[PDB]
Amino acid sequence: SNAMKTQVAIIGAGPSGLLLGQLLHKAGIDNIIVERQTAEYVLGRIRAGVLEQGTVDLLREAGVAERMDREGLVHEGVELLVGGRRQRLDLKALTGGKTVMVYGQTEVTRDLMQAREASGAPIIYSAANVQPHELKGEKPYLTFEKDGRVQRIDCDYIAGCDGFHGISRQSIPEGVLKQYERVYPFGWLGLLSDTPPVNHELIYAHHERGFALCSQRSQTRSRYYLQVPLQDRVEEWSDERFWDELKARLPAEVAADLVTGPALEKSIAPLRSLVVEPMQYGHLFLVGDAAHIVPPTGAKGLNLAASDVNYLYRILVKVYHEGRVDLLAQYSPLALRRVWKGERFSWFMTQLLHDFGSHKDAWDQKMQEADREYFLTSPAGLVNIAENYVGLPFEEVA
Amino acid sequence: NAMKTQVAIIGAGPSGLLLGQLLHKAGIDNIIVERQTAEYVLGRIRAGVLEQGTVDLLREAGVAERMDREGLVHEGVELLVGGRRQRLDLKALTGGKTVMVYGQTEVTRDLMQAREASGAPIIYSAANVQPHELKGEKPYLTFEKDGRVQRIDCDYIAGCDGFHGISRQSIPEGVLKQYERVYPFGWLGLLSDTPPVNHELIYAHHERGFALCSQRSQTRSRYYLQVPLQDRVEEWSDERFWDELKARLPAEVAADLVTGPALEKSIAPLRSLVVEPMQYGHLFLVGDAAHIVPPTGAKGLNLAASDVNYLYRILVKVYHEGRVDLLAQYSPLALRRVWKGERFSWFMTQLLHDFGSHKDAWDQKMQEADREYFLTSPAGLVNIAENYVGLPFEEVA
Numbered sequence: 001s002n003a004m005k006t007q008v009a010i011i012g013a014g015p016s017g018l019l020l021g022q023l024l025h026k027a028g029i030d031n032i033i034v035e036r037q038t039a040e041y042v043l044g045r046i047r048a049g050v051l052e053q054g055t056v057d058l059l060r061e062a063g064v065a066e067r068m069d070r071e072g073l074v075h076e077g078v079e080l081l082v083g084g085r086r087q088r089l090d091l092k093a094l095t096g097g098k099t100v101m102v103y104g105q106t107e108v109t110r111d112l113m114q115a116r117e118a119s120g121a122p123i124i125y126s127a128a129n130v131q132p133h134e135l136k137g138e139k140p141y142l143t144f145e146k147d148g149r150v151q152r153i154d155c156d157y158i159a160g161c162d163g164f165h166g167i168s169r170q171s172i173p174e175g176v177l178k179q180y181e182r183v184y185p186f187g188w189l190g191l192l193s194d195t196p197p198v199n200h201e202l203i204y205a206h207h208e209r210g211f212a213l214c215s216q217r218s219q220t221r222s223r224y225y226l227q228v229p230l231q232d233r234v235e236e237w238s239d240e241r242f243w244d245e246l247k248a249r250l251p252a253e254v255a256a257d258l259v260t261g262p263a264l265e266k267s268i269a270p271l272r273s274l275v276v277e278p279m280q281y282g283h284l285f286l287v288g289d290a291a292h293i294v295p296p297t298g299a300k301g302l303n304l305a306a307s308d309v310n311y312l313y314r315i316l317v318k319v320y321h322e323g324r325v326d327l328l329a330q331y332s333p334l335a336l337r338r339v340w341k342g343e344r345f346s347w348f349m350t351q352l353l354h355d356f357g358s359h360k361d362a363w364d365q366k367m368q369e370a371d372r373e374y375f376l377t378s379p380a381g382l383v384n385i386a387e388n389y390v391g392l393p394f395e396e397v398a
Numbered sequence: 399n400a401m402k403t404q405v406a407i408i409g410a411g412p413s414g415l416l417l418g419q420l421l422h423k424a425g426i427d428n429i430i431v432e433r434q435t436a437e438y439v440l441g442r443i444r445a446g447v448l449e450q451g452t453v454d455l456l457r458e459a460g461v462a463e464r465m466d467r468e469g470l471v472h473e474g475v476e477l478l479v480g481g482r483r484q485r486l487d488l489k490a491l492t493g494g495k496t497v498m499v500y501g502q503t504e505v506t507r508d509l510m511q512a513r514e515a516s517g518a519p520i521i522y523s524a525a526n527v528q529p530h531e532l533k534g535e536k537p538y539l540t541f542e543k544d545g546r547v548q549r550i551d552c553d554y555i556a557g558c559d560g561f562h563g564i565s566r567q568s569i570p571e572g573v574l575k576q577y578e579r580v581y582p583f584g585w586l587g588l589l590s591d592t593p594p595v596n597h598e599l600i601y602a603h604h605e606r607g608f609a610l611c612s613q614r615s616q617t618r619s620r621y622y623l624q625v626p627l628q629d630r631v632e633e634w635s636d637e638r639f640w641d642e643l644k645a646r647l648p649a650e651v652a653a654d655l656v657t658g659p660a661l662e663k664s665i666a667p668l669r670s671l672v673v674e675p676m677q678y679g680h681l682f683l684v685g686d687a688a689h690i691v692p693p694t695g696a697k698g699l700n701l702a703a704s705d706v707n708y709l710y711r712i713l714v715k716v717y718h719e720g721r722v723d724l725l726a727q728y729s730p731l732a733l734r735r736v737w738k739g740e741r742f743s744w745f746m747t748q749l750l751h752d753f754g755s756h757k758d759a760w761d762q763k764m765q766e767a768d769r770e771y772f773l774t775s776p777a778g779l780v781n782i783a784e785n786y787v788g789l790p791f792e793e794v795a
């Protein structure tokens with residue numbers, strides 16, 4: 001058949017692709033989203049839960065915040081647990097007013113999907129072998145297969161919002177991108193349960209046996225994590241083994257108040273820090289997990305995706321409304337400045353709260369311990385953590 | 399016959415002299431034994447920056463007159479990254495705390511003159527000093543001088559004998575545990591009779607490597623350059639030193655730098671080293687005998703001073719209040735502050751030096767990000783400033 005036509009072709013219907021598309025459509029910039037999996041499959045992913053104010057603001061601007069505001073929970077603080085002691089970080093007081101919002105990525109994604117349904121902005125699911133073409137040409141395009149037919153999308157710009165295993169990043173020629181990576185010797189084993197959270201705020205716990213995070217998605221939906229060796233598989237961890245181990249890494253007081261229950265979802269995510277430079281090539285712009293990855297210890301993943309969306313969205317508005325086509329050259333510079341800040345903090349928190357075993361020498365272990373002392377005791381240290389946790393500012397586009 | 403005292407002190411460097419001066423004043427007898435001659439000890443060119451805790455201690459010891467007259471109070475320090483100058487107003491950021499620039503040699507000289515005036519015994523050129531009966535109730539030292547073996551009977555031994563001392567090596571095998579990080583570089587220092595390029599210290603990170611613009615007075619400058627461990631001082635002419643220093647500074651700063659012939663020039667290797675515990679029986683390790691820091695945080699002499707402070711306050715209570723229980727608190731107290739200083743010294747070293755290929759691309763990227771974060775965040779600067787002026791001494795109660 002004949003080629004579909006739009007202004008911005010978006011690869012990936014995850015939070016990045018959907019939010020970008022929603023913001024663009026509201027601003028009168030035509031876009032089409034193509035996604036490899038089914039709508040159901042995308043919604044089945046249990047991932048992030050902590051939204052920085054910048055992300056919340058973007059969602060409000062996109063006009064998809066009614067449910068987030070009603071069913072989400074503003075968290076004014078977080079706890080770091082070292083040596084069995086519970087240290088609360090009053091993010092609100094430490095930052096002079098900032099907070100975080102606990103609302104599931106799945107929920108955010110569902111809201112964005114319902115909003116796109118209402119607008120009628122085209123979105124195509126179960127699209128196989130999406131390939132971008134003529135990234136340097138003036139007329140880039142996408143091809144894909146669906147319903148046993150090759151389909152084409154002509155556009156001006158391509159936004160690669162296709163995640164860690166996307167096609168976007170891989171479509172850029174060799175030499176162009178440079179990669180910076182740190183692979184951690186552990187993953188997070190996550191368990192979502194239909195049970196009351198043990199605390200009204202997140203508890204990041206460092207314990208001799210290893211790291212543990214007590215989290216949640218609502219007043220009736222809990223999310224717990226344990227660091228685990230890379231070899232470990234989710235089949236080796238029954239619901240009971242996970243509950244017992246979580247209990248062993250928490251103080252007796254918290255262990256007793258913990259209400260356990262069957263896992264609605266359980267899986268292991270390997271931890272890695274990854275960044276590519278630049279985050280664009282010609283008319284293709286990499287957004288979110290397609291460009292960078294962080295360990296979730298700082299709750300920065302989805303929030304960095306959102307800042308990437310922020311910058312590309314505000315540049316594109318000026319490209320089409322003010323004809324400033326060349327402003328797109330500042331996308332990577334802007335995005336990367338904030339990516340490195342979040343990457344730094346995510347790296348810092350991972351080093352601070354995890355058991356590295358033989359992967360760190362004796363000196364580095366002592367420095368981990370002295371950092372745990374200093375950062376949770378010094379008022380300036382607590383302020384260092386709090387201001388990073390709530391999310392550093394977005395810079396203005398010139 | 400044998401010499402008798404309460405506390406026998408090994409080493410006549412800053413640790414040993416300050417501990418001896420404080421103890422003597424409190425009425426606690428002490429003898430100091432030193433391997434080198436007095437002249438040789440004075441020939442050493444090292445520290446220059448004193449925390450208020452160290453300044454307070456010297457005033458308490460009654461050896462502050464010359465420091466209060468010739469030392470210079472610094473209200474800030476500068477950190478320099480990619481041309482940017484970030485002044486840390488220590489006073490404004492820490493609620494009034496400052497640092498004192500006064501040479502370690504000057505402090506050492508003043509202490510030596512005060513002990514001479516008091517007549518508290520001190521023995522130079524004490525060879526093969528050895529401690530014995532560390533856990534017994536009657537510990538003692540032996541040493542050789544003027545062709546004869548001499549003995550000092552005491553109640554406690556203070557090992558203030560530095561990195562190459564005998565005290566640490568005298569403790570039975572396996573008791574001590576050594577934590578260490580050896581840096582792939584040293585500091586080439588040059589003392590010059592020229593005006594400092596700035597009235598405050600300048601810690602400069604540069605693609606080519608770290609440089610420190612420091613001073614001993616308004617007429618005497620002290621500059622440092624990081625150099626690889628292979629380097630020998632004989633490979634560094636004054637000319638090469640000056641040119642390299644200028645290459646590591648913004649052109650606008652280098653332009654007015656006044657160069658001159660070296661009065662002293664040597665390379666010190668950098669290392670982070672902590673020994674635990676810091677005592678065995680009636681033997682206590684003090685200062686460099688127990689721990690080393692890279693000088694990037696100006697913590698060395700200052701940690702030695704806090705070790706001295708704790709051992710001194712404990713001994714006062716031991717002798718005047720029979721608080722023998724408190725001797726077990728020396729290592730816990732000293733190590734709490736030592737680890738904090740070690741952390742800071744490590745932090746500053748990581749932040750400001752070039753590690754070449756001793757650091758992978760990811761760690762270089764985290765250095766770059768740390769320099770961006772700590773030097774632009776108000777909280778980041780507070781963090782550095784409060785560590786730089788030195789964290790408080792805890793009370794020995």
Ligand SMILES: Cc1cc2nc3c(=O)[nH]c(=O)nc-3n(C[C@H](O)[C@H](O)[C@H](O)COP(=O)(O)OP(=O)(O)OC[C@H]3O[C@@H](n4cnc5c(N)ncnc54)[C@H](O)[C@@H]3O)c2cc1C
Pocket residue numbers: 011012013014015016017034035036037042046047048049050105127130161162163164165166167168190269287288289290296299300301302303305
């Ligand atoms: C497995 C996993 C677990 C995580 N857990 C946590 C956590 O516990 N806490 C936390 O704070 N953060 C977590 N994160 C981080 C956070 O969820 C991500 O940063 C966030 O999902 C990034 O959104 P995105 O839209 O950039 O990528 P994604 O959410 O991955 O969306 C990418 C979309 O593109 C689609 N796609 C991929 N390839 C193609 C193709 N060739 N053609 C078309 N479409 C394609 C995918 O199907 C997907 O729907 C996790 C991330 C992952 C991947």
Ligand SMILES: Cc1cc2nc3c(=O)[nH]c(=O)nc-3n(C[C@H](O)[C@H](O)[C@H](O)COP(=O)(O)OP(=O)(O)OC[C@H]3O[C@@H](n4cnc5c(N)ncnc54)[C@H](O)[C@@H]3O)c2cc1C
Pocket residue numbers: 408409410411412413414431432433434439443444445446447502524527558559560561562563564565587666684685686687693696697698699700702
């Ligand atoms: C080479 C070097 C360079 C340094 N440079 C700097 C710098 O540039 N900036 C900075 O801030 N800090 C620096 N420092 C750190 C700071 O000067 C030290 O922390 C400080 O000197 C510690 O004092 P101390 O008395 O504990 O040890 P020392 O000053 O080493 O005194 C130990 C004394 O014990 C004596 N002794 C050793 N063995 C025996 C024995 N068996 N019997 C009898 N006596 C013995 C020694 O002769 C010496 O006099 C440096 C340290 C060293 C070693």
Ligand SMILES: [Cl-]
Pocket residue numbers: 045046047048049104105106107217
């Ligand atoms: Cl979720």
Ligand SMILES: [Cl-]
Pocket residue numbers: 345348384385388
């Ligand atoms: Cl931090």
Ligand SMILES: [Cl-]
Pocket residue numbers: 341342345388391392393
């Ligand atoms: Cl941030």
Ligand SMILES: [Cl-]
Pocket residue numbers: 330396397398
């Ligand atoms: Cl811009």
Ligand SMILES: [Cl-]
Pocket residue numbers: 738739785788789
């Ligand atoms: Cl300190």
